[PDB]
Design an enzyme around this catalytic site. Structure first.
Site, PDB file in Angstrom:
ATOM      1  N   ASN B 165     -16.899 -25.068 -40.328  1.00 48.45           N
ATOM      2  CA  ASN B 165     -18.181 -24.774 -39.684  1.00 48.45           C
ATOM      3  C   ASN B 165     -17.998 -24.624 -38.187  1.00 48.45           C
ATOM      4  O   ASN B 165     -17.254 -25.376 -37.559  1.00 48.45           O
ATOM      5  CB  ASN B 165     -19.167 -25.894 -40.001  1.00 48.45           C
ATOM      6  CG  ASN B 165     -20.589 -25.450 -39.730  1.00 48.45           C
ATOM      7  OD1 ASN B 165     -21.146 -24.813 -40.609  1.00 48.45           O
ATOM      8  ND2 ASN B 165     -21.117 -25.775 -38.568  1.00 48.45           N
ATOM      9  N   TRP B 166     -18.709 -23.631 -37.648  1.00 49.44           N
ATOM     10  CA  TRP B 166     -18.850 -23.411 -36.193  1.00 49.44           C
ATOM     11  C   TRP B 166     -20.334 -23.580 -35.838  1.00 49.44           C
ATOM     12  O   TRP B 166     -21.180 -22.906 -36.423  1.00 49.44           O
ATOM     13  CB  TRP B 166     -18.413 -22.003 -35.825  1.00 49.44           C
ATOM     14  CG  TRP B 166     -16.955 -21.721 -35.988  1.00 49.44           C
ATOM     15  CD1 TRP B 166     -15.958 -22.595 -36.264  1.00 49.44           C
ATOM     16  CD2 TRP B 166     -16.324 -20.426 -35.778  1.00 49.44           C
ATOM     17  NE1 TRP B 166     -14.721 -21.948 -36.205  1.00 49.44           N
ATOM     18  CE2 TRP B 166     -14.934 -20.642 -35.906  1.00 49.44           C
ATOM     19  CE3 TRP B 166     -16.817 -19.156 -35.490  1.00 49.44           C
ATOM     20  CZ2 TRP B 166     -14.005 -19.595 -35.724  1.00 49.44           C
ATOM     21  CZ3 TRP B 166     -15.878 -18.141 -35.286  1.00 49.44           C
ATOM     22  CH2 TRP B 166     -14.518 -18.363 -35.435  1.00 49.44           C
ATOM     23  N   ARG B 170     -25.236 -30.333 -28.531  1.00 47.12           N
ATOM     24  CA  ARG B 170     -24.977 -30.805 -27.162  1.00 47.12           C
ATOM     25  C   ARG B 170     -23.962 -31.942 -27.154  1.00 47.12           C
ATOM     26  O   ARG B 170     -23.924 -32.780 -28.091  1.00 47.12           O
ATOM     27  CB  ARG B 170     -26.283 -31.235 -26.532  1.00 47.12           C
ATOM     28  CG  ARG B 170     -26.845 -32.537 -27.045  1.00 47.12           C
ATOM     29  CD  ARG B 170     -28.203 -32.827 -26.415  1.00 47.12           C
ATOM     30  NE  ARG B 170     -28.618 -34.206 -26.697  1.00 47.12           N
ATOM     31  CZ  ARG B 170     -29.863 -34.631 -26.782  1.00 47.12           C
ATOM     32  NH1 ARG B 170     -30.881 -33.804 -26.774  1.00 47.12           N
ATOM     33  NH2 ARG B 170     -30.079 -35.930 -26.898  1.00 47.12           N
ATOM     34  N   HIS B 188     -24.976 -28.848 -40.058  1.00 44.72           N
ATOM     35  CA  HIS B 188     -23.671 -28.797 -40.743  1.00 44.72           C
ATOM     36  C   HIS B 188     -22.646 -29.693 -40.095  1.00 44.72           C
ATOM     37  O   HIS B 188     -21.791 -30.253 -40.854  1.00 44.72           O
ATOM     38  CB  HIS B 188     -23.192 -27.371 -40.873  1.00 44.72           C
ATOM     39  CG  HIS B 188     -24.026 -26.578 -41.819  1.00 44.72           C
ATOM     40  ND1 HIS B 188     -24.027 -25.199 -41.824  1.00 44.72           N
ATOM     41  CD2 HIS B 188     -24.860 -26.985 -42.806  1.00 44.72           C
ATOM     42  CE1 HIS B 188     -24.832 -24.841 -42.796  1.00 44.72           C
ATOM     43  NE2 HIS B 188     -25.362 -25.897 -43.421  1.00 44.72           N
ATOM     44  N   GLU B 230     -18.432 -19.806 -40.809  1.00 45.99           N
ATOM     45  CA  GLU B 230     -18.980 -18.846 -39.828  1.00 45.99           C
ATOM     46  C   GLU B 230     -17.942 -17.796 -39.459  1.00 45.99           C
ATOM     47  O   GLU B 230     -18.309 -16.632 -39.256  1.00 45.99           O
ATOM     48  CB  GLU B 230     -19.441 -19.527 -38.562  1.00 45.99           C
ATOM     49  CG  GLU B 230     -20.830 -20.213 -38.634  1.00 45.99           C
ATOM     50  CD  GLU B 230     -20.949 -21.504 -39.386  1.00 45.99           C
ATOM     51  OE1 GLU B 230     -19.889 -22.033 -39.815  1.00 45.99           O
ATOM     52  OE2 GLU B 230     -22.099 -22.010 -39.524  1.00 45.99           O
ATOM     53  N   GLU B 279     -34.588 -30.855 -22.851  1.00 46.22           N
ATOM     54  CA  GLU B 279     -34.386 -30.188 -24.141  1.00 46.22           C
ATOM     55  C   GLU B 279     -35.255 -28.916 -24.257  1.00 46.22           C
ATOM     56  O   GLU B 279     -36.117 -28.586 -23.418  1.00 46.22           O
ATOM     57  CB  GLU B 279     -34.704 -31.177 -25.277  1.00 46.22           C
ATOM     58  CG  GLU B 279     -33.855 -32.454 -25.403  1.00 46.22           C
ATOM     59  CD  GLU B 279     -34.363 -33.456 -26.447  1.00 46.22           C
ATOM     60  OE1 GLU B 279     -33.605 -34.441 -26.744  1.00 46.22           O
ATOM     61  OE2 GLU B 279     -35.554 -33.367 -27.002  1.00 46.22           O
TER      62      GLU B 279
END
Ligand code: 4LU
Ligand code: 4LU
Ligand code: K
Ligand code: K
Ligand code: K
Ligand code: K
Ligand code: MN
Ligand code: MN
Lengths: 498, 498
Positions: B165-166, B170, B188, B230, B279
């Site tokens: 997973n990519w 933060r 993920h 990805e 945020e």
């Protein structure tokens, strides 16, 4: 005469402001005048003055469109509304609404009767006019009639003579000597009409004055209290007694400088087809005709070279947004304050199609109440949604002191981020609803009841100890010196009012 | 290398677009770089490249701010996102989201392993770097740390090797060789972290790559399905296999042209203080620090003259709006279509602070379903709010075919006028909620559950016989010839793309 006291002088003011386009070639009142006006309203362009209207005869009539719509510049955005009220053209919305509220705690200044005025320069008796032969506009292609009345003032008086109401309500031509129009509860024209119908003796003496003093058309669009004569409220607001003249065929009084006056009666018995009309929420429902009130016209009087103002209303932004929404919000602010609620400001965001009002709360006062969201929402909604001033408004959004309610982007930000759907809202089903909103009159539920909500966009600590956040924005997330350094070096580093 | 496949080439593209400001005088990473970037994002200005960052040493590092933010012009508004994807700079949002979805029905194109790349030009072992000595920005004055990671890609792999997973999440500097960051369900990175914690044998091999191929950072920000690597999705989207290189200290693979790579582990046991952070919804809650995931850094590799991209996130408009909201909306559109719902388009309005998604309905298909609002709302909300792609979205607005969901003013108009509060909505309390929204994590109810709603802004006849209104606007309330006449005579009468 000053612009706020004389419509003809108001038109001259817009010219001198470079806020008018005079159109001296022939324009068709069948859709063309309204299409140009609609485009003006959608683009915040200069107001159009149609000096050469196909079908004008013997001085009836020229048209001014977009009399209360927005200007393009941010610095004089509300300048046309300021010009209704003798305010500088750079007046803020707060200043305009404060001016409109100023008379609420002043003695009325009753009007002055004068023997004549410009509105008597020309007259047509019942054998000499035909409303179907005037250049009355078709404003939207699917309208159910030619809406002569979009920016005039209806004048009706209680049977006992003690209250004379001035208000705007639409009306269209029915035949050579009648109009039909909206007369719906809880509006004051409806409340007065019911008094005459209960008396049961005669039709309601009536006049409709077009091109009235601008300060008067503003009050005509505002829900000032039951029983308050708008003429004395406008007198107090402007500091001057309004000059009125008696109608020829009844004992009502109309502004001396009115451009055009219809005199007659509003029936207590008869109705006729009315609508559909392209309305303030942005819709027309073709074929949606219903029985409306029926007005008989007995006499027309008018100024030389009379000018009819016209609102080409619909999607943003026109008089139905700038004046209906803002003036209702003003009255709601005052109503909340008189019910001891800590509201400082109110505005109907244009983005809500003026179906919401955002209420700015003085949270220091809220904290001292030692209350909760559920209790406070219910108290605010009970005050507003049980009052006539809340009639047209279906969502109230409570926001704290950091939000400028006159800025729709900030209201939308607060609503979207501070009000938890369901939990932070209270629904109101047992209140009068505004049937003109599509989701009411053309929706899934009762057209006249419910569909209202108070949405609390106050955060929990605003009720207790105080705001516990800072915005993640340039203003609040950086110290003052750094901000000023960035601004002072902005164009130097390579980056990009009237 | 093409701009969409190489961050260094992307920076050159922004220059040649006249969409970059190079700032070659010293800029402080303590607030100044982020303040300039914040101002850029609030004003849709050119992206800033800070070439002279106070504290840069031995090539670490320059900063590019606002890599995915908006341009001022309407015609190339989304040009920086188009430049991530080899699309023309005038690409519409529909075209960008279609490009991002295009790989969903293609075979993956797995990456190609190459022996070296620019990201290996320089290296620092565990005795040679200190994360507290790099020019890591303080992005907002009240942040709980220096957020090194705002626009890099975390790389983690399932224990069985079958899913890599990519994603963007933060992270801030904890000490000379650790970060802390957000790792929360159902993301993920969290799902993979749970697989390693259940296995219980070791910390998670990890890398964080900054300045990756732009097409890869787009996919990193998108909720493509569980179990989908990805890299192969980006390969299929771009038509080319991505070139990756092995990390020095573990067996993960990073883009060959990455500007900066951190290699190490994500702990299955340890936590450390994380946040607060300014945020995506526009807030920071000072002092609101909580335990977050803890990452150990064992090695840094980097390009000569490395560039760190940075998102100065908060109030509109930045990457947390343009990419988080839009890419989630894209995935929701596809999810609805795969569940046989008649949705043509989806977008997260910026005005909602990307907490709403508007869903455009093919009302011909809706009519054939012979359903009702209550049933349809419930079906849509069950599909979306029970899926990861709906995690961040709290209000779905259903609109008919006349509404362009990519235009926030039209969504706001439809919502405000077609959805009756309460009656035309269904609340969802038993679904996962997004705790980052202030009304969730700092609100009156459970931070992680509920607070969602489907708002039906379809009118009743849209389910039955068809639209029964026309808009009261220039477009719909006037015939075509008249409109064209008005437009052709506009500047002539006296009134006012790239
Ligand atoms: C500015 C303005 C106000 C309209 C209005 C319009 C404009 C331009 C039109 C004519 C273009 C579209 C329809 N209008 C109606 C209307 N109120 C109403 O009862 N019927 C209407 O037909 N109003 C609102 C009405 O004037 C306010 O509710 C007043 O408060 C009514 O005065 P009252 O409080 O004395 O009853
Ligand atoms: C563009 C972008 C996406 C952030 C993001 C940011 C940006 C600039 C920041 C770093 C500036 C602010 C915080 N971010 C976080 C985040 N998701 C999350 O779980 N934690 C976060 O801290 N996201 C969203 C996340 O990347 C998307 O939800 C992906 O779908 C996650 O990938 P996944 O589906 O493979 O889990
Ligand atoms: K009135
Ligand atoms: K709240
Ligand atoms: K992803
Ligand atoms: K509806
Ligand atoms: Mn009144
Ligand atoms: Mn993923």
């Amino acid at each position: 005469q000053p612009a706020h006291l004389c419509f003809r002088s108001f038109v001259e003011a817009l010219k001198v402001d470079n806020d008018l386009v005079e159109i001296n070639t022939p324009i068709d009142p069948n859709l063309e005048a309204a299409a140009i006006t609609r485009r003006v309203c959608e683009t915040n362009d200069k107001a159009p003055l149609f000096n050469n209207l196909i079908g004008m005869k013997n001085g009836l009539f020229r048209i001014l469109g977009a009399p209360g719509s927005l200007r393009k510049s941010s610095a004089d955005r509300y300048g046309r509304l300021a010009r209704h009220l003798a305010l500088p053209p750079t007046a803020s919305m707060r200043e305009i609404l404060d001016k409109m509220l100023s008379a609420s705690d002043m003695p009325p200044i009753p009007p002055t009767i004068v023997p004549t005025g410009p509105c008597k320069e020309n007259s047509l008796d019942d054998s000499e006019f035909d409303l179907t032969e005037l250049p009355v506009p078709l404003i939207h292609k699917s309208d159910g009639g030619k809406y002569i009345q979009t920016y005039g003032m209806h004048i009706v008086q209680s049977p006992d003579g003690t209250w004379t109401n001035w208000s705007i309500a639409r009306a269209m031509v029915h035949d050579k000597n009648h109009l039909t129009g909206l007369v719906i509860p809880p509006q004051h024209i409806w409340q007065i009409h019911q008094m005459w119908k209960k008396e049961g003796r005669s039709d309601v003496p009536w006049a409709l004055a077009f091109g009235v003093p601008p300060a008067a058309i503003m009050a005509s669009s505002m829900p000032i209290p039951d029983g308050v004569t708008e003429a004395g409220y406008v007198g107090a607001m402007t500091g001057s007694s309004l000059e009125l003249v008696k109608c020829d065929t009844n004992d009502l009084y109309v502004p001396a400088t009115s451009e055009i006056v219809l005199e007659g009666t509003l029936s207590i018995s008869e109705t006729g087809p009315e609508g559909p009309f392209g309305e303030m929420h942005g819709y027309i429902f073709p074929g949606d005709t219903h029985l409306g009130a029926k007005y008989k016209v007995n006499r027309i009087t008018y100024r030389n070279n009379a000018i009819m103002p016209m609102s080409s209303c619909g999607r943003l932004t026109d008089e139905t947004h700038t004046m209906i929404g803002s003036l209702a919000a003003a009255e709601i602010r005052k109503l909340c304050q008189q019910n001891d609620l800590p509201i400082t400001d109110a505005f109907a965001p244009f983005e809500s199609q003026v179906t919401w009002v955002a209420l700015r709360v003085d949270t220091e006062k809220l904290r001292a109440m030692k209350t909760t969201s559920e209790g406070f929402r219910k108290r605010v909604g009970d005050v507003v949604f049980n009052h006539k001033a809340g009639y047209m408004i279906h969502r109230l959004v409570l926001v704290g002191d950091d939000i400028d309610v006159y800025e729709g982007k900030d209201v939308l930000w607060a609503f979207s981020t501070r009000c938890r759907p369901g939990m932070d809202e209270t629904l109101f089903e047992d209140v009068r609803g505004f049937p003109l909103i599509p989701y009411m009159g053309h929706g899934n539920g009762p057209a006249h009841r419910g569909g209202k909500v108070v949405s609390d966009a106050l955060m929990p600590t605003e009720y207790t100890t105080g705001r516990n956040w800072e915005a993640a924005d340039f203003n609040q997330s950086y110290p003052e010196d750094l901000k000023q350094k960035v601004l002072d070096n902005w164009t130097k580093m390579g980056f990009s009012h009237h």
